[PDB]
Design an enzyme around this catalytic site. Structure first.
Site, PDB file in Angstrom:
ATOM      1  N   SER B 150      -9.010  27.950 -21.295  1.00 58.82           N
ATOM      2  CA  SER B 150      -9.132  28.564 -19.956  1.00 58.82           C
ATOM      3  C   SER B 150      -8.012  28.244 -18.946  1.00 58.82           C
ATOM      4  O   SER B 150      -7.604  29.098 -18.169  1.00 58.82           O
ATOM      5  CB  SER B 150     -10.491  28.245 -19.335  1.00 58.82           C
ATOM      6  N   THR B 155      -2.205  34.255 -18.578  1.00 61.66           N
ATOM      7  CA  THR B 155      -1.970  35.309 -17.586  1.00 61.66           C
ATOM      8  C   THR B 155      -0.521  35.369 -17.087  1.00 61.66           C
ATOM      9  O   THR B 155      -0.050  36.449 -16.694  1.00 61.66           O
ATOM     10  CB  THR B 155      -2.919  35.176 -16.375  1.00 61.66           C
ATOM     11  N   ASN B 207      -9.941  26.403 -14.305  1.00 61.36           N
ATOM     12  CA  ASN B 207      -8.873  27.272 -13.798  1.00 61.36           C
ATOM     13  C   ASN B 207      -9.268  27.963 -12.479  1.00 61.36           C
ATOM     14  O   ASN B 207     -10.303  28.613 -12.407  1.00 61.36           O
ATOM     15  CB  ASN B 207      -8.520  28.315 -14.879  1.00 61.36           C
ATOM     16  N   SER B 210      -9.335  31.873 -13.051  1.00 60.46           N
ATOM     17  CA  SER B 210      -9.965  32.139 -14.341  1.00 60.46           C
ATOM     18  C   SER B 210     -10.495  33.578 -14.426  1.00 60.46           C
ATOM     19  O   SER B 210     -11.294  34.013 -13.593  1.00 60.46           O
ATOM     20  CB  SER B 210     -11.133  31.167 -14.547  1.00 60.46           C
ATOM     21  N   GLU B 435     -13.966  27.899 -23.105  1.00 58.77           N
ATOM     22  CA  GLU B 435     -14.517  27.535 -21.794  1.00 58.77           C
ATOM     23  C   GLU B 435     -15.890  26.867 -21.921  1.00 58.77           C
ATOM     24  O   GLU B 435     -16.754  27.352 -22.657  1.00 58.77           O
ATOM     25  CB  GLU B 435     -14.601  28.784 -20.896  1.00 58.77           C
TER      26      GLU B 435
END
Ligand SMILES: Nc1ncnc2c1ncn2[C@@H]1O[C@H](COP(=O)(O)OP(=O)(O)O)[C@@H](O)[C@H]1O
Ligand SMILES: [Mg+2]
Lengths: 48, 888, 67, 67
Positions: B150, B155, B207, B210, B435
């Site tokens: 996570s 990204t 995160n 997230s 996660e």
């Protein structure tokens, strides 16, 4: 294997590089002779 | 070099450098170099040192000796250096820096584009470009896959990849820096990310940004190799958390951005308040670093404007998102004399039904004491405080799912202007990571499951596919298996065949109205009992706890209310009202009501349906992995936990993968292709006459004097070790470059001549223009021109014959268009009457079949009743015959 | 070029739509063959079951005659 | 005009060829449904035959016990 192939190649390439060097020496002397000829021509034109 | 130097295990650093003194049996005595501390290890514990020359070395495939500790040390040194990227043969590994760096520019993009990996340092741009070039050359489909937990950084990789694509894949309009004006579809694509993030991401312990959802982007290309369209797929999201917030966790960013960013005008329009004014907002306002909520609110709305949103279709989203936020304030109190719910704060309901444009009276009573249709009858449902709470929360989930669906469809429809044609495509997969937190419900399990299933897919494609290919071609190779396998855990959860897995049992015990979540967990414990990957309750049987084994560690689960997640129950009365909302937007959101459930399809089976589809795409396409590594769980830059990166690297199987990469033969080419691509190197040796091309390939390979360990000759494919073909290609191209330059000079000469010739025509045109303009400019101040201008229109140009002729000409064209329009009209009329008659016949036939079905089904029910009657009478007769037989 | 683009788009769309129909033909043929195998299996089951029934009736009548 | 003629001819030919494939899909689906009905009928036959067999065995055992 790569080193052996290179060793063979270097021997050939040195001999050919000598040929190329000689060709450049010949063309150098030809260009020098051309320079003298055209210098003579320039002097003749100046006198004329 | 001192051969006694070794990596020794470390509690702080995972491994650290040390020096052997002596050895004894199966053990070695060593001194740690950091402090001179003596210790004894097993000969199996210690690992061989990375030599100085290999310090911070690039590709793991190049290492003198494969050691986990050497890889760890190279990674730590590179993380301290700030060079986050490292190659691993065919793929790449990275590590989250938690801090921005200038590793990205147009200059870098232009430097990398079209270059070979061997001539360049590592970068994600290289991976993106390689996938693009191979896609273009082979005309197959390709894909890029980011993976990690996570906090691991996916990204940022994804953001860089789609940015790279949005410049390299662009077609040139014929019209330099990062403010370059991209194409319309690229401009939408680059705004889609911040749009989706705002609506779909939240803060977690793992995160601050997230993603609550899994996503897949794809870009489509033409035959020339330029972008012509795109698609954005998005999978089921962790929607539950949004009104049931754990400590220091946040809802979807859009909520905080709206509540902070709204003007007084907007706030009154939406009937909104400030923070902590909402029952659905546990913990109240929760902060987030680096963000600026007001500014974010502005930029996300502006992003929607760039995505071509009207102001109304923005404010309508604000109205519905306000409605789910406000409806939590519909507080209930139970009447002890009846156990039915009541509503003292009817003001909240009035506000909500106003924002939805429905009747307050019906809205109040459909929540508190609804009348529901159960088969033939329509009956008053007894409704507790808890059932009313459940109903309004379920309504909030329904509103949210409809609004998110609308957003995702709207963003795709922006792209859907493009035509249906295409040559191939390039995909980008971005699934939410591994996660875990204080609670583990079904909503987290599906995501964790797909994460591990993706690793199992990698196991197949990386390890098994190779052995299969080598065996197919029949080459001199030997099988090996290092035992990377998750299959029993997959089989524990899924049901391709019996016995039934977790999903099947959850659906079965959900369907049975007498069963509950205790029944589900009991059945799971009984039927899976001593399965290698299953584990029973941690004594807390009353808590209905159970556990499953995963490569990321064993995980304990909490089964409470999983049945409502599968069943998706929703209130029919409020659904009916909202379907007929006064607001066109809300009426559109609630247009479909066929998933109404007053007690259909299983969420597990729905999830399986989308999973198999995407996985089939992953099997058809060629993936490129880019693995990302978590440095620490405190979200801190520079700091690195050795044990975290060690165990992540281990479970990713990179130490095993790199071994088979170097040991095997990664390059492979068909013999005819090999000959046609490189024949120039052996054209004097290779015979002109027709034969098996593998003979010509053998002759060429012999002429090159390659070591027989570097390749293997199959019946169709010839396999080669890493990069040899690409270096031979470079040499072959270099052989051609000399004549290419001579031809290039000729073509550029032709182009220059053409340009100059055009310039001459332009120059002569310009000269006559200059003559004319100068002549007029000198003279136009003379007075007589005014009189000339008055007089000329009275005298010159008869006009009317030319006008008449033009009108007559256009009349003929208009008459032709009329004739064509009337012909088209007649054609459409003929088809219209046919379709009308066919419709009539089908409607009549349909009504007949419906009547026949009704007649059959009613008699079927009747016969079933008679069957039951006769069976009961037969039971009575069997009882009687037994009583007779006992008496006799 | 625009005429080419339009006609090619039409050709592509019409081709892919009917190619999906061809995939449905393949699925239908697979299902047909599967059901054909099921019919043969069930016919064998009926054969065995009927033979067993008739044998049971034969034994019943024999025992009834012996009693 | 020639490009129009060619592309239109190709579209027509490919469309009629795949329409024949669609008719083959219809035939395949009809056959599939027919065999599906046959499977259901045969399953009903197996149900009845097996029930009759078990009843015959029950009566056989009963009479054998009575003898
Ligand atoms: N390549 C990178 N350059 C700069 N910062 C990065 C990079 N990769 C990760 N980060 C940092 O890591 C943080 C969290 O990473 P993120 O992309 O959210 O990971 P994940 O998607 O796995 O949760 C980011 O906010 C950023 O500060
Ligand atoms: Mg993320």
């Amino acid at each position: 294997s790569n080193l052996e192939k290179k060793q063979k190649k270097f021997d050939q390439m040195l001999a050919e590089e000598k040929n190329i060097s000689s060709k450049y020496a010949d063309e150098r002397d030809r260009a020098e002779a051309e320079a003298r000829e055209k210098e003579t021509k320039a002097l003749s034109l100046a006198r004329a | 070099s001192a051969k006694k130097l070794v990596w020794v295990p470390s509690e702080k650093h995972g491994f650290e450098a040390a020096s052997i003194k002596e050895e004894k049996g199966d053990e070695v005595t060593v001194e740690l170099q950091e402090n001179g501390k003596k210790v004894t290890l097993s000969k199996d514990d210690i690992q061989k040192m990375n030599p100085p020359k290999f310090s911070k070395v690039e590709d793991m495939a190049e290492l003198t000796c494969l050691n986990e500790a050497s890889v760890l040390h190279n990674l730590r040194e590179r993380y301290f250096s700030g060079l986050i990227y490292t190659y691993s043969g065919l793929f790449c590994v990275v590590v989250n820096p938690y801090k921005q760096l200038p590793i990205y520019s147009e200059k870098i993009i232009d430097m990398y584009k079209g270059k070979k990996r061997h001539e360049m340092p590592p970068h994600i741009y290289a991976i993106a470009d390689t996938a693009y070039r191979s896609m273009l050359q082979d005309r197959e489909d390709q894909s890029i896959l980011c993976t990690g937990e996570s906090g691991a950084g996916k990204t940022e990789n994804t953001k860089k990849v789609i940015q790279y694509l949005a410049v390299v894949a662009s077609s040139h309009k014929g019209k330099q820096g990062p403010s370059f004006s991209y194409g319309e579809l690229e401009k939408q694509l680059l705004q889609a990310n911040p749009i989706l993030e705002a609506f779909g991401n939240a803060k977690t312990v793992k995160n601050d940004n997230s993603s609550r959802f899994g996503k897949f982007i794809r870009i489509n290309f033409d035959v020339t190799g330029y972008i012509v369209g795109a698609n954005i797929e998005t999978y089921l999201l962790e929607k539950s958390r949004a009104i049931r917030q754990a400590k220091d966790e946040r809802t979807f960013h859009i909520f905080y951005y709206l509540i902070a960013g709204a003007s007084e005008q907007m706030r009154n329009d939406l009937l909104l308040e400030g923070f902590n004014n909402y029952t659905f907002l546990s913990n109240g306002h929760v902060p987030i670093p680096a963000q600026q909520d007001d500014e974010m609110f502005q930029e996300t709305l502006e992003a929607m404007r760039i995505m071509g949103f009207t102001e109304e279709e923005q404010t309508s989203i604000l109205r519905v998102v306000s409605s789910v936020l406000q409806l939590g304030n519909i507080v209930f109190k139970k009447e002890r004399n009846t156990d039915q719910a009541s509503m003292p704060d009817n003001t909240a309901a009035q506000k909500v039904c106003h924002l939805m444009g429905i009747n307050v009276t019906d809205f109040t009573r459909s929540i508190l004491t609804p009348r529901i249709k159960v088969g033939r009858d329509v009956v008053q449902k007894a409704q507790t405080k808890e059932q009313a709470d459940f109903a309004i929360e379920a309504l909030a989930k329904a509103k949210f799912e409809r609004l998110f669906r609308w957003i995702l469809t709207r963003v795709n429809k922006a792209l859907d202007k493009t035509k249906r044609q295409g040559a191939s495509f390039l995909g980008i997969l971005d699934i939410a990571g591994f996660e875990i937190f204080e609670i583990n419900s079904f909503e987290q399990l599906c995501i964790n499951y797909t994460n591990e299933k993706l690793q199992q897919l990698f196991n197949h494609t990386m390890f098994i596919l190779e052995q299969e290919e080598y065996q197919r071609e029949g080459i001199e190779w030997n099988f090996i298996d290092f035992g990377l396998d998750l299959q029993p855990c997959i089989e524990l959860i899924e049901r391709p065949t019996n016995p039934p897995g977790v999903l099947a049992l959850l659906d079965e015990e959900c369907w049975f109205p007498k069963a509950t979540d205790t029944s589900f967990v009991e059945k799971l414990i009984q039927e899976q009992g001593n399965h290698p990957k299953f584990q029973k309750s941690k004594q807390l049987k009353d808590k209905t706890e159970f556990c499953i084994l995963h490569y990321a560690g064993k995980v304990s689960y909490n089964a409470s209310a999983w049945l409502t997640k599968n069943m998706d129950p929703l209130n029919d009365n409020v659904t009916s009202l909202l379907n007929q909302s006064s607001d066109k937007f809300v009426a559109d959101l609630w247009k479909d009501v066929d998933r109404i459930v007053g007690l259909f399809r299983t969420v597990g089976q729905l999830y399986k349906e989308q999973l198999t589809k995407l996985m089939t795409t992953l099997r058809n396409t060629n993936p490129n992995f880019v693995r990302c590594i978590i440095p620490n769980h405190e979200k801190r830059a520079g700091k690195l936990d050795a044990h975290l990166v060690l165990e992540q690297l281990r479970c990713n199987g990179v130490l095993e993968g790199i071994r088979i990469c170097r040991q095997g033969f990664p390059n492979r080419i068909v013999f005819q292709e090999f000959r046609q691509r490189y024949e120039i190197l052996a054209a004097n040796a290779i015979p002109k006459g027709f034969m098996d091309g593998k003979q010509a390939c053998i002759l060429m390979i012999k002429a090159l004097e390659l070591d027989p360990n570097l390749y293997r000759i199959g019946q169709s494919k010839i396999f080669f070790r890493t990069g040899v073909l690409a270096h031979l290609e470079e040499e072959r191209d270099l052989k051609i470059t000399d004549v290419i330059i001579a031809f290039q000079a000729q073509c550029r000469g032709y182009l220059a001549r053409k340009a100059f010739a055009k310039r001459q025509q332009q120059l002569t045109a310009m000269k006559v223009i200059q003559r004319n303009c100068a002549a007029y400019l000198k003279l136009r101040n003379w007075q007589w021109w005014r009189l000339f201008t008055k007089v000329k229109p009275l005298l010159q140009v008869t006009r009317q014959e030319e006008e008449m002729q033009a009108k007559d000409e256009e009349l003929q064209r208009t008459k032709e268009r009329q004739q064509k329009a009337e012909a088209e009209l007649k054609e459409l009329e003929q088809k219209h009457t046919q379709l009308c008659e066919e419709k009539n016949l089908l409607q009549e036939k349909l009504q007949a079949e419906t009547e026949l079905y009704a007649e059959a089904e009613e008699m079927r029910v009747r016969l079933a009743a008679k069957k039951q009657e006769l069976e009961e009478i037969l039971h009575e007769m069997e009882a009687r015959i037994e009583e007779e037989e006992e008496r006799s | 070029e625009e005429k080419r683009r339009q006609l090619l788009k039409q050709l592509h769309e019409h081709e892919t739509e009917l190619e999906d129909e061809r995939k449905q033909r393949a699925l239908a043929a697979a299902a047909k063959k599967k059901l054909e195998v099921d019919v043969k299996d069930l016919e064998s089951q009926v054969d065995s079951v009927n033979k067993a029934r008739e044998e049971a009736i034969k034994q019943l009548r024999k025992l009834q005659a012996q009693m």
